[PDB]
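README: folding subset

This subset contains proteins for which both the sequence and a predicted structure token string are available. Records are stored as plain text. Below is the entry for Benzoate-coenzyme A ligase (518 residues), shown exactly as it appears on disk.
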Amino acid sequence: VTPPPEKFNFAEHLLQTNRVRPDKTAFVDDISSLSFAQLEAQTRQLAAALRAIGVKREERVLLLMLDGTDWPVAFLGAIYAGIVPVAVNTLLTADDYAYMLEHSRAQAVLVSGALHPVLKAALTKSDHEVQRVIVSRPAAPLEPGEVDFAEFVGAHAPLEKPAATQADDPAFWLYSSGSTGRPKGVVHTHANPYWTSELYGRNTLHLREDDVCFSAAKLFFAYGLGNALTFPMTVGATTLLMGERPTPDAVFKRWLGGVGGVKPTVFYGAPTGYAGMLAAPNLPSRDQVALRLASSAGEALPAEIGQRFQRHFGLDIVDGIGSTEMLAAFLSNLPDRVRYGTTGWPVPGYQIELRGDGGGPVADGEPGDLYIHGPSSATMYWGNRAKSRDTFQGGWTKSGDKYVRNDDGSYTYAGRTDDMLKVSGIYVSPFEIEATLVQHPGVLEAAVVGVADEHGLTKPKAYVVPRPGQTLSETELKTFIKDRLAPYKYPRSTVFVAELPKTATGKIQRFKLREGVL
Ligand SMILES: [C]C1=N[C]=C(C(=O)O=P([O])([O])O[C][C]2O[C](N3[C]=NC4=C3N=[C]N=C4[N])[C]([O])[C]2[O])S1
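--- output ---
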């Protein structure tokens, strides 16, 4: 793979690549579609619109939008103008967005109408620098100053040339959370999604022009950003986007060609999603779908889920591990080489290290801390030098995982080194859940650990000490957590206990809870 030139604008690169297929569908969702030509026009018109309102090169804008054909226009349009889009989760609270607006110093916000209310709350309570709010598909009247995304794009002539960016300049940000502290702004360069899209999308998955890509993982996830934007645009594939929550019925409807007259040939999701679909009553048969490749990421794929998917569809699930910091997978099974119970082999282009307790090599079969050296690594966490020093160490990126290398060169996941839990393939901090539970007036203490469910998938499990003298029923506690935590963070069960095992210094002995002692 030939490195990108030093003068390089990722958005312009993706546009140029597809000037050979102007009338092929680039993106299609429930209500709209965009050829590569139409996408290029609207991308460059949005870039001009953003510059016209005074957003200058290297400044950030907040991109808070459901998956839809407007999403890649917003993302590539900012990048084409040398403006840095900060692409964020659509299921967060006003407080979360308030912090992101201040931390990013976003100068404009591109928001889906359905998300305007939470953004309104975030703008009102924050010390933001937002100059303009641009609402894609408004769901309510427009407040003074705000503009409709389609009118905004339609009102400016396409920018004549891209910003003269370098390949190592920041191009976009994603946020990722550790076990405590604020979400971390992961800064990715113009080069990084070129490397992931060439090394993984093209050379590992073998995506191609006649593919139709469909990702249960949303575009604001690093995984989804590759699956359904950078990978397909790199090979000219057509991408199906879906705004709504990715339930089995929603997914099946798309698999069967219920949207845009296209049937997906490549599907991406988390193992939890695959388990959910395999259990659905209306699982399609192979003759009904056009899938040729099924990708999985976010959490380890239990062998039995892959085996059941293979037995039903005649297709393996290809399990790879990536991270927000590395942007896409660096360890992966191959489409024609799958070993269930492992994450496969290093992606060519990435060097992998397992380090022991002195930082040195570990022997095959023993766990070590995983570190990755690859050309797609994020450069830093914006504004957090301490965590950046901890993570990005002179060419090597600490993943937070432990892995075991097998005799055939494959790698088996062996857990985290930080307490973080991956539930439905999404980061969850047990300390957040604990902190939420102890604000219930009936809870004295709480400890949360991860437990494998019947399918081998990790879920939170809560141990709660009731506050003496307070009626506390499981049902009232479930309702308490319903409106305070996103559903994927719900504890699978809650065990009420009279005490928690504690050292003798006030620390909960969480491993005894993992061990089943209570
Ligand atoms: C491609 C891709 N990108 C991204 C991803 C992810 O997931 O990211 P985040 O959120 O940052 O996270 C990371 C983590 O998670 C986990 N995983 C993933 N994948 C996997 C896993 N594990 C196991 N296996 C697999 N496949 C870990 O922890 C990491 O570090 S993807």
